[PDB]
């Protein structure tokens, strides 16, 4: 999981999702692309 | 919205009981009961089920959409039924059913025993295959996740409890 | 043919102009010829969309000031320092 102030889509398979008031990047193709704003 | 506006066809021999926000859908395969959100207004009429937002409720269409999707798979439930298929991969990994309990050999010191809930039923066509059957799409999905949880597919050989339809990406170990 | 709708200005100066811009409008002037200059007010969004078309600065425009039609040409434009907005337009009578 990457925790940073600036979360972005990294590839086409990346998806931005707001779970529990926290912007997140979920990705089907690369687990390295997993992000949490914080 | 597009989901909510789409009506759910209630077939022959399927009973729909609607006491306010409580819906009981009875068929050949079983009896499922659900409580809809107060923003959903469910109308019976003919051989269909129609969903729509309730006045003064902000997320009405989002709520009716969910209600629709649920009641559809409730009907498909008490009629056709749902099937989840799991397959055990790895030397020594075996499974067997003894009534309402799935016995599992998954590489631990102690053998795993999993108590199935009301409605979910399992059968083992092989020592390495588990087939689950039930009416509640949520419960069957839960049980299959819990059984997978014991030994999740490892990324280096694919060993562990996997879903039949599951694509298990593997990888090479560090070079040197 | 670009058609612009305008009102004559009831007020002049810093105060009145800033007030216009606050109301999604802007001042502009029509000068040239024997006729005395005419201080007018324009809808911001309308003239902003027009001026985006290159042809606006080359073509002969028609300004409808209380029924009367005025054939003009865009002389000079005062733009907002950093926003995509218009502050003032000079229209010369053609």
């Amino acid at each position: 999981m990457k925790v940073r102030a600036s979360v972005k889509k990294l590839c086409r398979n990346c998806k931005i999702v707001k779970r529990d008031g926290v912007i997140r990047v979920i990705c089907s193709a690369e687990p390295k692309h997993k992000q949490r704003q914080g | 919205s597009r989901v909510a506006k789409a009506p759910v066809v209630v077939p022959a021999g399927v009973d729909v009981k609607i006491n306010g926000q409580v819906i009981t859908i009875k068929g050949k395969n079983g009896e499922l009961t659900r409580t809809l959100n107060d923003a959903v207004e469910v109308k019976h009429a003919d051989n269909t089920l129609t969903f729509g937002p309730r006045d003064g409720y902000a997320d009405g269409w989002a709520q009716a959409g969910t209600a629709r999707a649920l009641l559809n798979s409730m009907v498909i439930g008490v009629t056709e039924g749902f099937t989840k298929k799991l397959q055990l991969v790895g030397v020594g990994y075996r499974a067997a059913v003894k009534g309402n309990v799935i016995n599992l050999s998954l590489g631990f010191s102690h053998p795993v025993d999993h108590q199935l809930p009301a409605g979910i039923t399992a059968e083992c066509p092989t020592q390495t295959e588990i087939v689950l059957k039930g009416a509640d799409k949520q419960v069957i999905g839960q049980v299959a996740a819990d059984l997978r949880a014991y030994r999740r597919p490892e990324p280096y050989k694919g060993k562990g409890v996997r879903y039949a339809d599951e694509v298990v990406r593997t990888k090479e170990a560090k070079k040197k | 043919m670009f058609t612009i709708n305008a009102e004559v200005r009831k007020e002049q100066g810093k105060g009145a102009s800033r007030r216009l811009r606050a109301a999604n409008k802007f001042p502009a002037i029509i000068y040239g010829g024997k006729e005395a200059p005419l201080a007018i007010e324009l809808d911001h969004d309308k003239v902003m969309n027009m001026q985006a078309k290159a042809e606006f600065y080359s073509e002969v425009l028609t300004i409808v000031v209380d029924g009367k039609e005025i054939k003009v040409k865009a002389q000079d434009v005062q733009r907002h320092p950093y926003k995509p907005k218009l502050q003032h337009i000079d229209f010369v009578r053609a």
Binding site: - | - | A54, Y57, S58, A74, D76, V77, R79, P81, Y82
Partner: protein, 136 residues
């Protein structure tokens, strides 16, 4: 790194940085990077931004730098008390008012100019906007 070749005087009063900019239009290129905020750009910041946009366009096209760091900025070293003269000149800045076209570019497609300008914007202490040239 930009800096005046000579100066009438070494040091300059702090002054103030009030008002709106002069040089608010793309005057040489097709595209520009315009200042939306107020502040000081240092010669090092200007260079960092210029390098970033130059890499971006793979040295194709032409770049103009509409700003010049001509204000000397003095600094008093550590463990030095107040007074005893004005500090020594350490670096050079260009005062920026909102509206200033900072850089200009031509000879490259809009999509690339927009990229190159996003990359340079990241190195600057003030908020910027992309601007295109206009007919009057």
């Amino acid at each position: 790194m930009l800096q005046p070749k000579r100066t009438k005087f070494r040091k300059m009063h702090k002054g103030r940085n009030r008002g709106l900019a002069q040089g608010t239009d793309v005057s040489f290129g097709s595209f520009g990077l315009k200042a939306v905020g107020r502040g000081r750009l240092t010669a090092r910041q200007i260079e960092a931004a210029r390098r970033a946009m130059t890499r971006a366009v793979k040295r194709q096209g032409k770049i103009w730098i509409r700003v010049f760091p001509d204000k000397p900025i003095t600094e008093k070293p550590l463990a030095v008390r107040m007074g005893k003269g004005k500090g020594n000149v350490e670096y050079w800045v260009a005062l920026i008012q909102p509206g200033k076209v900072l850089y200009e570019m031509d000879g490259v497609p809009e999509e690339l100019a927009r990229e190159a300008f996003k990359l340079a914007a990241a190195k600057l202490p003030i908020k910027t906007t992309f601007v295109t040239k206009t007919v009057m």
